[PDB]
Amino acid sequence: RKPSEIFKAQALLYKHIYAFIDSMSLKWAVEMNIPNIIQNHGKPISLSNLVSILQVPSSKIGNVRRLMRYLAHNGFFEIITKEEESYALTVASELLVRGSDLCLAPMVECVLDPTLSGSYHELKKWIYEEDLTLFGVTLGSGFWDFLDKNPEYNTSFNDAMASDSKLINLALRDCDFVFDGLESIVDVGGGTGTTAKIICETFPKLKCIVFDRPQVVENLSGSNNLTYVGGDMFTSIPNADAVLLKYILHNWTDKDCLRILKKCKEAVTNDGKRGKVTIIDMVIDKKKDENQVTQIKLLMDVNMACLNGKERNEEEWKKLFIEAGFQHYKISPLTGFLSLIEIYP
Amino acid sequence: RKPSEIFKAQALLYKHIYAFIDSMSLKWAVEMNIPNIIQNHGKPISLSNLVSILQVPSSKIGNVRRLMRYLAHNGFFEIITKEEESYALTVASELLVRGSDLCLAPMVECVLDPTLSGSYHELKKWIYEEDLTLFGVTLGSGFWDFLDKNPEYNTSFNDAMASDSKLINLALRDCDFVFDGLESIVDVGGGTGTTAKIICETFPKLKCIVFDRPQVVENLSGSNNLTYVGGDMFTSIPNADAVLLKYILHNWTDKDCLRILKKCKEAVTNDGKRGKVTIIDMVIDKKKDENQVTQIKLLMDVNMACLNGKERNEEEWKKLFIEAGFQHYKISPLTGFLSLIEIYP
Numbered sequence: 001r002k003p004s005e006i007f008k009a010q011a012l013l014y015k016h017i018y019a020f021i022d023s024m025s026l027k028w029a030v031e032m033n034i035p036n037i038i039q040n041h042g043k044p045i046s047l048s049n050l051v052s053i054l055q056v057p058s059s060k061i062g063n064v065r066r067l068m069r070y071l072a073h074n075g076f077f078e079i080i081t082k083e084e085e086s087y088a089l090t091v092a093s094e095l096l097v098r099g100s101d102l103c104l105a106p107m108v109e110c111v112l113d114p115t116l117s118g119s120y121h122e123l124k125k126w127i128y129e130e131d132l133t134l135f136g137v138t139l140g141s142g143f144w145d146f147l148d149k150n151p152e153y154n155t156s157f158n159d160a161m162a163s164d165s166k167l168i169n170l171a172l173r174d175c176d177f178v179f180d181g182l183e184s185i186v187d188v189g190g191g192t193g194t195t196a197k198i199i200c201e202t203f204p205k206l207k208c209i210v211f212d213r214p215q216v217v218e219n220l221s222g223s224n225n226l227t228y229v230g231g232d233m234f235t236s237i238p239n240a241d242a243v244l245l246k247y248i249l250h251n252w253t254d255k256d257c258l259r260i261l262k263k264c265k266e267a268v269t270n271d272g273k274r275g276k277v278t279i280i281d282m283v284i285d286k287k288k289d290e291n292q293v294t295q296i297k298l299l300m301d302v303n304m305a306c307l308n309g310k311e312r313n314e315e316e317w318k319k320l321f322i323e324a325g326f327q328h329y330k331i332s333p334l335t336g337f338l339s340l341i342e343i344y345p
Numbered sequence: 346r347k348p349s350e351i352f353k354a355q356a357l358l359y360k361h362i363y364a365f366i367d368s369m370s371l372k373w374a375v376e377m378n379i380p381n382i383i384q385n386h387g388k389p390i391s392l393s394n395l396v397s398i399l400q401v402p403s404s405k406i407g408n409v410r411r412l413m414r415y416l417a418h419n420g421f422f423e424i425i426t427k428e429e430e431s432y433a434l435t436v437a438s439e440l441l442v443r444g445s446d447l448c449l450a451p452m453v454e455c456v457l458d459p460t461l462s463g464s465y466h467e468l469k470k471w472i473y474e475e476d477l478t479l480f481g482v483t484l485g486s487g488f489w490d491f492l493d494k495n496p497e498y499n500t501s502f503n504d505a506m507a508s509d510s511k512l513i514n515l516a517l518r519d520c521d522f523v524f525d526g527l528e529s530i531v532d533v534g535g536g537t538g539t540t541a542k543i544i545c546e547t548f549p550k551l552k553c554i555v556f557d558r559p560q561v562v563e564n565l566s567g568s569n570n571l572t573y574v575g576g577d578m579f580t581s582i583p584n585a586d587a588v589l590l591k592y593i594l595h596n597w598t599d600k601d602c603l604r605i606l607k608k609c610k611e612a613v614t615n616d617g618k619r620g621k622v623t624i625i626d627m628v629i630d631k632k633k634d635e636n637q638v639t640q641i642k643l644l645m646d647v648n649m650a651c652l653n654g655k656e657r658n659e660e661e662w663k664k665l666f667i668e669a670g671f672q673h674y675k676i677s678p679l680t681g682f683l684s685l686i687e688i689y690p
């Protein structure tokens with residue numbers, strides 16, 4: 001109990017109690033297709049033209065205006081006022097326009113699914129579980145098994161992973177030091193082969209194996225140098241000169257990462273060979289990164305409770321590599337929030 | 346498509362996609378009883394003592410640390426580092442300590458109920474409804490009927506309304522200009538009589554009627570000058586020299602507010618008398634309020650979609666008063682986010 005610093009603390013508490021409205025209002029704008037409507041309009045759109053296109057009832061027009069102004073203050077639209085109030089895209093809402101260079105709208109829709117995002121109401125039950133991941137607590141099965149049983153969820157997750165894929169995959173194939181001298185590579189947890197296809201288009205003579213769970217690669221067909229193998233990375237990974245792990249390790253505890261890293265080391269050290277493992281994931285660095293960037297990485301780290309995952313700093317990465325028996329490593333920036341890490345057995 | 350301003354826009358988009366984590370992590374701290382554990386400890390608590398008291402499994406201790414650091418950066422705890430990392434309360438988390446002067450933890454728990462807060466996933470369906478409120482869309486009945494059928498929800502809502510009641514009610518009873526000369530007052534939507542009891546303790550000769558829905562006031566007993574009346578404010582409000590509306594009008598559309606205001610005007614103009622109506626609710630004022638304050642009011646306005654409610658600025662309030670047939674009004678600051686508005690028939 002202090003003076004009027006209580007009103008200030010109350011404002012902070014309210015901001016956080018209602019923070020979910022920032023997520024739900026953004027979801028609403030994407031579901032209403034507002035970014036694309038504005039892009040197609042070719043100029044800032046008036047409130048009257050917007051609600052005309054949306055065909056909302058007149059009793060809810062004021063509610064559309066209130067939501068638009070809330071999203072604009074957050075940076076997703078720019079309000080221009082003349083005879084009428086109009087709404088223009090911003091660089092942030094341009095990221096939600098279809099066919100734009102980098103479109104992350106599928107990420108908004110995937111993450112904000114009611115069941116998945118609603119799982120965070122159970123952080124208390126989860127913190128008391130010795131082994132279950134947050135999704136394991138709420139979905140009743142592990143996440144990958146869950147995707148296998150729920151096609152619409154699998155589609156949504158794949159579209160979300162695809163959404164920043166071009167950017168990362170092009171940054172990766174532009175890294176000659178990763179591919180120099182390789183004759184073969186296996187993309188572990190390679191999905192439907194998105195990364196591998198870009199790799200093969202770039203390096204036509206390189207053999208690339210897309211390795212993932214049987215249900216993921218079933219019925220997929222490869223072609224000239226690109227093949228698919230269904231398996232379990234905790235049991236056996238195909239031999240190759242190198243292993244790629246893109247967005248894999250941050251989905252697992254340190255104990256599980258050690259299991260995966262041991263199987264990768266085995267895969268690149270068969271028949272006397274001494275290959276390497278290439279990892280794409282975030283590297284937290286509080287002293288080097290710009291604060292804004294560090295804050296998003298820390299936020300992603302908390303979000304990884306979904307799979308008992310983690311976003312790691314350099315000392316955490318180093319400790320795993322050493323414990324898995326790798327002799328040295330190198331970290332390079334790759335693109336945006338991600339780094340390229342190479343580890344040598 | 347621009348230069349590296351894309352990475353900056355991506356950081357903004359991610360902040361908003363995952364904003365619900367700010368709400369869920371705050372809910373987690375209250376459910377784990379962390380603010381009270383720290384208060385009872387009497388000093389900043391070490392991570393090891395905290396997880397000892399919580400009895401979380403060792404596999405989740407790191408997750409407790411990650412959540413604590415995320416909440417601390419948000420302002421809910423202060424990290425103190427010595428031989429160990431320790432966590433101290435802040436003015437904002439002191440608002441979550443039981444028996445503290447002003448405790449808003451019940452507000453966090455009420456609002457963040459999964460069903461209620463989860464309703465905001467349906468903003469699109471709601472914006473297309475001519476009449477339904479957001480809660481009407483998701484709960485299948487109006488909110489008040491819903492509380493009548495769900496005791497635990499009614500308890501949670503009452504505890505939440507009670508949480509800032511002492512502060513507002515004491516500010517109200519200290520306003521002599523409101524009570525001077527009154528012989529009777531009816532608190533419309535008066536709940537279980539929380540405000541009326543403070544009014545009667547202050548003004549022992551004043552007659553006060555607590556008026557609310559029959560299920561709310563059933564079995565409640567009054568005493569000397571305080572009585573309870575069950576009814577419907579849209580149909581008939583008991584005559585009195587004045588009507589009090591605390592946190593009522595912001596829960597209704599302009600059309601419904603006009604209906605309530607007409608019934609209040611009738612109640613204070615019977616038998617040739619010319620009484621008044623006293624309203625306690627927010628008044629948005631972008632040019633007078635500090636920006637931080639305006640932002641919370643605008644945020645509460647968006648949140649009122651739950652009941653098709655609204656937080657109004659002075660011109661919006663004035664337009665309702667005039668349309669309801671009141672001749673003039675006066676607005677005064679009351680406490681924190683609230684104003685005291687008096688309207689004269």
Ligand SMILES: Nc1ncnc2c1ncn2[C@@H]1O[C@@H](CSCC[C@H](N)C(=O)O)[C@@H](O)[C@H]1O
Nearest residue numbers: 161189190191212213231232233234246247
């Ligand atoms: N035991 C296991 N063995 C092999 N792959 C696995 C696995 N458990 C999970 N995976 C998978 O790892 C994934 C990784 S998420 C998508 C990853 C892909 N590298 C990309 O960047 O898009 C899923 O494709 C998933 O099926």
Ligand SMILES: Nc1ncnc2c1ncn2[C@@H]1O[C@@H](CSCC[C@H](N)C(=O)O)[C@@H](O)[C@H]1O
Nearest residue numbers: 506534535536557558576577578579591592
């Ligand atoms: N038709 C109606 N007639 C009378 N009261 C009503 C009503 N519809 C809703 N109410 C009520 O208005 C409320 C107001 S919320 C709590 C209000 C109370 N003045 C306080 O400040 O705590 C509920 O108590 C609710 O039952």
Ligand SMILES: COc1ccc2c(=O)c(-c3ccc(O)cc3)coc2c1
Nearest residue numbers: 110111112116117247248251303306
């Ligand atoms: C493989 O790389 C990733 C990266 C991010 C996520 C992610 O963010 C979620 C997630 C989190 C919260 C939700 O509400 C919904 C989905 C699930 O898997 C993931 C896998």
Ligand SMILES: COc1ccc2c(=O)c(-c3ccc(O)cc3)coc2c1
Nearest residue numbers: 455456457461462592593596648651
């Ligand atoms: C009478 O005054 C009020 C003031 C605020 C609220 C409120 O904030 C909610 C609410 C909003 C979102 C949720 O998730 C849960 C509850 C319901 O009724 C209310 C009534």
